[PDB]
Ligand binder design. Structure first.
Ligand SMILES: Cc1cc2nc3c(=O)[nH]c(=O)nc-3n(C[C@H](O)[C@H](O)[C@H](O)COP(=O)(O)OP(=O)(O)OC[C@H]3O[C@@H](n4cnc5c(N)ncnc54)[C@H](O)[C@@H]3O)c2cc1C
Ligand SMILES: Cc1cc2nc3c(=O)[nH]c(=O)nc-3n(C[C@H](O)[C@H](O)[C@H](O)COP(=O)(O)OP(=O)(O)OC[C@H]3O[C@@H](n4cnc5c(N)ncnc54)[C@H](O)[C@@H]3O)c2cc1C
Ligand SMILES: NC(=O)c1ccc[n+]([C@@H]2O[C@H](COP(=O)([O-])OP(=O)(O)OC[C@H]3O[C@@H](n4cnc5c(N)ncnc54)[C@H](OP(=O)(O)O)[C@@H]3O)[C@@H](O)[C@H]2O)c1
Ligand SMILES: NC(=O)c1ccc[n+]([C@@H]2O[C@H](COP(=O)([O-])OP(=O)(O)OC[C@H]3O[C@@H](n4cnc5c(N)ncnc54)[C@H](OP(=O)(O)O)[C@@H]3O)[C@@H](O)[C@H]2O)c1
Ligand SMILES: CCCCCCCCCCCCO[C@@H]1O[C@H](CO)[C@@H](O[C@H]2O[C@H](CO)[C@@H](O)[C@H](O)[C@H]2O)[C@H](O)[C@H]1O
Ligand SMILES: OC[C@H]1O[C@H](O)[C@H](O)[C@@H](O)[C@@H]1O
Ligand SMILES: OC[C@H]1O[C@H](O)[C@H](O)[C@@H](O)[C@@H]1O
Lengths: 504, 504
């Protein structure tokens, strides 16, 4: 009498959502609208309808040790910050090791997920799915939604009077792939998220002049941290977490801001914003400062008005003979197949722990990977998936509707106090906070106080070292044999791919 | 009556050597073998015989405020680290301001410069020159040699057994221009001078894999120094100079090395050499560490042997399916037109203050810009030129042959004690030491002790601020009226091109 779980999407979130089903003995059916896995990380030269488009050169901004699945370490020889193709290969490896591919039926789009007539007792969903033009209806005991949130382009043309008049080319970051078409041209980038940044430096290699236009400015991080350790291996350690907690937000901020200014002074470089370090989604770009100091990227304020030829800026300055404008203005999400269960408006959604609709008579619809962490999504989707599948079996249970809604509203409230008021700051999470939060719900949070005495060597690494995901496969339901071994050898794996010449 | 001076070459050194002549009332004839000025900084898509070839993307590693001519500051809006095109434009500006172009005859190569029969009394040179096939002979009262030293490729194929056997492409850095010739290829770079570095990162943008092969390793700097000030504006300040002098070499070294390790640990990154920071010509690359941590540049030891397909490395590791090898193995210099007078063998020459042959009955042959400074060459060539033209008249005089040769030998000796034993470390200079040394001989060293009392505001900048070249146009022979004004506004010009977006 095995519960059948629909997993929608076969990216990082889909893949782990299948594994998490199999591991609690549920039968996963996985629908994936394209002809392969990886979702966002499977680069193609052309954009595809209804799946995340990326550019060829993209290198992931989260260290391999911090983004691995908890029970499947990334290979020793893989670099600390992997190219999009290496992320994809690792996903393929994950899917072979846990035999996930057979449960996927590709080329299959999910049109509709409606609670059934008997939902108040059965908790079951009517999933409708088209496949090369032929419909199909099925019933399921639970649904895990693993569609992305970097798919539907946010192209706010309405807030750029005279863009309709502009006679150069202009398009969303989505459609950017390589800089060939920009040799010796003058290009404006709108927005200073990681798309803005990546494109501003890349296009500046070929282009005559790139302008990086920001309406706010940005605090700007480097993945090459102190001593060349990955910045997230350093910042996301339980010790740094504890130091942050006693020191408070505004002092943490002053530390981080003063750190970033030592690298380059955001005021002198024209990038300094009115907000604080932790009030914005981190923009990571080690190359941007060096391009700015050479004039090949020019930091600008917001474009107020476009002509046939030019941009006018909020400060009355003007830039002429503009060949192309790219809107790195980011993405909005929605659920066309769930316009009954889950509602989103301008990236505002209400979900308990970012996962469960609170207004469900049964807890049988999980939303996986709908978070913007200061960290990797894959490891959080996995914990979301461990938890999700447990409440599908009734091994764990949700609070009452009204107390779910208090936590939801409490979260939206402090997120709104903390983060700059923009559509991209609606689902922010911190990495350690989030991993612990969901780990505690699954009962796999490592007992670090006991281990202090029962194993002082492990205990030390767990605390003073990086808060690696493998940490959450030590104890509890999904307990993994080789967690302790891998957790201790985490240094070796960070160094393996860098000691390619002997020094001694 | 007024002495005629042959200036050989019309790059940075030629251009300033003409101006230095005009300013001591001498008649310059300038022979340039090419059809234009700029020498090394005039990029063309094809390499040209007997003039420095560079790559399209080259950005100068010395700050604008540290490389300007002493009496012609670079415009406000020009960036702190200029692209090769902007260096060239600035030279064109210099040549307009001081009306130098009319004294150049282009397409004219100097074949021979021989001391004349009456040289022990007349001090005159037989300069022979071909111009579109037809020779021409002339006599001169002095010769300033401004041929470069980054023209004749050093391609040491003999020390790569099996390169004759290799079936991919291979060429010297000289012939490199763009990375698009390497898309999806596996490329090995020999050498980690600035060409090695530049190409290793550039080619890694298109290439499947780049390997950066060094037989030594290298200490590696960043142009974006503390708070995003140009590193040379910070390191080359009389104050830093004095701090260095009391602390000694080994302590200075430990400071610089510990500084570079904070950015990235040269041991972990596999770049750390057995020598010290100041024992090697500085390799500057802000972008290299980020490419190494992503695997797109792989640090290797020396190639011991090439096959049809592969490189074998000094540590017995092998890399297969290698499409292309670029020898960034640097340059040798020589004087084909001066074999009678000046002897150069594997970059070892004997010249008093790097300028004067010591064995000359008259001091009427100056060698301009034959130095490898921890700084800009242009400003040193200029001071060399001020001095040179003074000793051509009778304003200044050289020591006796015997005491010149003791100083020459003393210089070669301590240079050999300090620097790693290699062809490119035969003419190393320190910037401040060298500027002061030559300034003192011209009597234009600024009297900073006097100014302490005569002008404490200026005195402070001269000491605590950057040791800008304009400093040496304050007092003495060539005195410039607008020096003090520019020296004080030096911060403004560093910031002008970076505050392109409103802060307040
Ligand atoms: C340029 C860029 C860089 C990024 N870098 C990082 C990073 O460094 N670290 C990080 O943690 N995150 C990063 N992200 C965020 C990124 O989205 C996540 O890392 C990761 O892609 C999450 O994948 P997912 O499986 O949750 O969603 P996706 O990868 O988008 O997977 C969704 C899948 O569902 C399919 N699908 C869509 N609609 C349907 C439907 N109706 N029915 C069936 N299938 C459907 C899609 O075709 C796709 O295969 C980046 C995003 C971008 C755009
Ligand atoms: C990629 C690269 C980057 C560099 N970056 C820097 C830097 O950042 N800072 C720095 O200070 N230095 C740098 N250098 C060093 C460089 O040598 C100087 O910047 C500067 O260009 C030297 O100028 P020059 O006039 O001494 O030589 P060149 O510019 O080489 O001038 C030589 C001229 O003489 C002509 N010539 C040669 N032989 C004859 C002949 N027999 N008769 C007539 N004409 C002749 C040539 O055609 C040419 O016009 C760099 C070098 C390279 C290759
Ligand atoms: N691995 C990588 O290197 C990499 C590369 C690219 C992207 N990413 C990831 O991809 C995700 C989204 O990418 P993104 O950078 O395109 O998204 P983003 O962070 O939403 O970028 C949006 C940028 O555009 C600005 N903007 C938005 N609307 C605007 C308007 N109407 N007018 C003017 N300016 C406007 C934003 O300012 P506000 O602050 O006002 O919103 C912001 O600077 C992020 O999770 C990021 O981590 C990663
Ligand atoms: N503005 C810029 O960005 C820029 C760019 C490029 C060049 N430049 C300048 O132009 C000048 C030329 O520099 P470059 O990189 O062309 O040459 P370089 O400084 O002479 O360095 C050559 C490299 O090749 C190595 N090498 C030499 N012979 C070798 C051999 N037989 N086997 C293996 N390796 C060998 C050297 O090692 P050793 O240490 O053993 O000599 C060194 O690492 C330099 O002053 C540089 O600063 C500036
Ligand atoms: C430049 C000044 C360096 O300042 C540096 O700050 C970082 C905080 O991110 C600390 O760096 C690290 O230390 C601890 C101790 O092993 C680690 O658990 C943690 O990953 C990290 O925070 C350094 O201990 C401190 O010296
Ligand atoms: O059409 C979208 C764009 O694709 C690529 O990014 C090209 O470089 C660009 O020229 C083109 O306009
Ligand atoms: O933000 C206000 C306060 O928050 C925390 O309680 C800190 O311990 C304290 O030092 C800080 O001033």
């Amino acid at each position: 009498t095995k519960k059948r779980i629909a997993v929608i999407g076969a990216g990082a979130s889909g893949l782990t959502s299948i594994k998490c089903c199999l591991e609690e003995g549920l039968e996963p059916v996985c629908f994936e609208r394209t002809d392969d896995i990886g979702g966002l990380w499977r680069f193609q030269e052309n954009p595809e309808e209804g799946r995340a488009s990326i550019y060829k050169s993209v290198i992931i901004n989260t260290s391999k040790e911090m983004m691995c699945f908890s029970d499947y370490p990334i290979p020793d020889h893989y670099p600390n910050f992997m190219h999009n193709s290496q992320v994809l290969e690792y996903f393929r490896m994950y899917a072979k090791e846990f035999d996930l591919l057979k449960y996927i039926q590709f080329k299959t789009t999910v049109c509709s997920v409606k609670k059934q007539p008997d939902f108040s007792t059965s908790g079951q969903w009517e999933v409708v799915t088209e496949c090369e033009g032929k419909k199909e209806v099925d019933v399921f005991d639970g649904v895990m939604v693993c569609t992305g949130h970097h798919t539907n382009a946010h192209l706010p043309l309405e807030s750029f009077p005279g863009i309709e008049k502009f006679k150069g080319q202009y398009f969303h970051s989505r459609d950017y792939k390589n800089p060939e078409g920009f040799t010796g041209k003058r290009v404006i980038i709108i927005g200073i998220g990681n798309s803005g940044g990546d494109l501003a430096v890349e296009i500046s290699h070929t282009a005559k002049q790139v302008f990086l236009s920001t309406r706010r400015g940005a605090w700007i991080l480097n993945r090459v941290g102190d001593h060349g350790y990955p910045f997230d291996v350093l910042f996301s350690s339980r010790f740094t977490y504890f130091l942050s907690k006693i020191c408070g937000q505004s002092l943490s901020n002053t530390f981080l801001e003063k750190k970033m200014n030592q690298r380059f002074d955001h005021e002198m470089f024209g990038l300094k914003p009115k907000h604080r370090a932790l009030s914005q989604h981190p923009t990571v770009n080690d190359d941007l400062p060096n391009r700015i100091i050479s004039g090949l990227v020019k930091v600008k304020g917001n474009v107020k008005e476009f002509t046939e030829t030019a941009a006018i800026f909020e400060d009355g300055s003007r830039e002429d003979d503009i060949d192309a404008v790219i809107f790195a203005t980011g993405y909005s999400f929605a659920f066309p197949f769930l316009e009954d269960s889950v509602k989103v408006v301008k990236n505002k959604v209400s979900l308990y722990k970012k996962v469960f609709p609170p207004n469900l008579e049964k807890p049988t619809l999980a939303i996986i990977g709908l978070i913007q962490p200061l960290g990797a999504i894959m490891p959080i989707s996995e914990l979301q998936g461990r938890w999700a599948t447990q409440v599908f079996k009734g091994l764990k249970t949700l609070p009452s509707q009204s107390e779910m809604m208090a936590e939801i509203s409490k979260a939206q409230e402090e997120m709104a106090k903390r983060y700059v008021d923009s559509q991209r700051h609606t689902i922010q999470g911190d990495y350690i906070d989030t991993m612990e939060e969901i780990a505690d719900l699954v009962g796999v949070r490592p007992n670090l106080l006991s281990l202090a005495f029962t194993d002082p060597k492990l205990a030390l690494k767990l605390f003073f070292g990086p808060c690696t995901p493998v940490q959450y496969r030590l104890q509890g339901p999904g307990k993994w044999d080789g967690a302790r071994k891998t957790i201790l050898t985490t240094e070796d794996r960070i160094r393996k791919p860098l000691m390619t010449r002997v020094i001694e």
